[PDB]
Structures are given as structure tokens and as C-alpha cells.
């Protein structure tokens, strides 16, 4: 089918993230999809091009 993450964002605070999901590319979407869940319930798409996502993964692996 198709990508869900058509619009990505970087205007977010690592500290507000509670979880991150990486969906690999395949027939449904030619690129990886990174969906972050804020602590308040909201979900946003991250851009793999920004390294923000690597900071998120370190903070999550810490706590």
C-alpha cells in the first residue's frame, strides 16, 4: 500500500518522548518510518535525515 508518514517533523523535545517505533521499508513504503509517541498521547513522524532521532533512542535506552 502506502506510507503513513507523509509529513515529518523535528520541532520536538526529546525529553517529551515516551516511545519510538521504527518500521522498515518494504512494499508499502520505500523508506523507513519513525513514529514517536509523546508522553501526552500524541504521535508524530520524525525525519530520518535529522539526527534528532538518535538522541531520542539514547534517552529512551537510558532511564
Residues that bind a copy of itself (CB under 8 A): 1-9, 11, 17-33, 35, 37, 39-45, 48, 56-57, 59-63
Q: Determine the distance from the C-alpha atom of residue 13 to the mean position of all C-alpha atoms in its chain, rounded to a whole number.
A: 12
Q: Which of a copy of itself, ligand TCN, none sits in contact with 7, Cβ below 5 to 8 A by type?
A: a copy of itself
4-63: contacts with ligand TCN (CB under 6 A) = 6, 29
Cβ proximity to ligand TCN, 6 vs 61, nearer residue:
6
Chain breaks in the chain (C to N over 2.5 A) after: none
Which class for 34: exposed (0-12), middle (13-18), buried (19 or more C-beta within 10 A)? buried
Amino acid at each position: 500500500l502506502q506510507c503513513v508518514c507523509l509529513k515529518t517533523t523535528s520541532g520536538i523535545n526529546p525529553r517529551h518522548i515516551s516511545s519510538l517505533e521504527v518500521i522498515g521499508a518494504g512494499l508499502h513504503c520505500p523508506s523507513p518510518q519513525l513514529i514517536a509517541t509523546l508522553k501526552t498521547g500524541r504521535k508524530i513522524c520524525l525525519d530520518q535525515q535529522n539526527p534528532l532521532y538518535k538522541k531520542i533512542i539514547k534517552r529512551l535506552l537510558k532511564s
